[PDB]
A paper describes a structure:
[name]/[name], a two-component signal transduction system, is responsible for regulation of tod operon expression in [name] strains. [name] lacks a transmembrane region, and its N-terminal PAS domain ([name]) binds a wide range of effectors, including toluene, to trigger increased basal autophosphorylation of [name], leading to a phospho-signal relay to [name] and ultimately transcriptional stimulation of the tod operon genes by interacting with phosphorylated [name] in the PtodX promoter region (11–14). The structure of each [name] domain is very similar to those described for other PAS domain structures, which consist of a five-stranded antiparallel β-sheet and three α-helices spanning residues 45–149.
We determined the structure of [name] in complex with the agonist toluene. In detail, the benzene ring of toluene is placed into the area formed mainly by the aromatic amino acids Phe46, Phe79, Trp84, Trp85, and Phe128.
Residue numbers in the entry:
A (entry chain B): 43 to 167
B (entry chain A): 42 to 165
The structure:
């Protein structure tokens, strides 16, 4: 189940975003509505992270189901980085034309947590 | 055309997100409807018949069939007033093809129908 969710048009302009994602980034609808999703502050760690989001939007708009782990300015009202399992789902109309994209973010398990999980299981056996 | 009201439903039609324009128009809070079937929400509650219609439309989209039709809803003045809406449901599939969400959209056509009524009188 997602944590962050957003609705984009086919070109990646922002239409709707849930409050959890806005509060996490310290971002308002007024700042991002109708402007490309990749320009919003969550994606602004670097020119590289913004370029990755732009490519994830463009490829989704071409009908790919894309997903990858990303770091975003998405905790403590945008002051801190979190890692997110990000996806875009193309949404087609009744003719098969992509008209929207559904952006979803889920939490990622800390590396040290996963290591602790396996250490504990090996130890419990 | 771009929607005025929009909602995201799960594969079974339970409400996940709705825009503020639809909530304010219907006089509905996100807590009253989240995680519960879309046809139970107040927009669809003019009668048992309207609710049954929305239930069947949701179930149709849940099978992958796209829906568009005109409907009336309790959607203006905090749920006090009925408006006519051009309504659609888009099934959203994952890459495997399974339906994972439904997108509900609507545009108020109350003033379009009144303008068509006036044109019909003028033409006479």
């Amino acid at each position: 189940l997602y944590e962050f969710v957003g609705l984009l048009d086919a070109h990646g302009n922002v239409l709707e975003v849930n409050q959890v994602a806005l509060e996490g980034g310290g971002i308002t609808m007024e700042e991002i509505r109708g402007k490309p999703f990749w320009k919003a502050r969550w994606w602004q760690i670097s020119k590289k992270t913004e370029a990755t989001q732009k490519r994830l939007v463009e490829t989704a708009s071409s009908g790919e189901f894309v997903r990858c782990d990303v770091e975003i300015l998405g905790k403590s009202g945008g002051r801190e980085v979190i890692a997110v399992d990000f996806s875009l789902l193309p949404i087609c109309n009744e003719e098969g034309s992509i008209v929207y994209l559904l952006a979803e973010g889920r939490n990622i398990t800390d590396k040290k947590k996963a290591e602790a999980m396996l250490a504990l299981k090996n130890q419990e056996l």
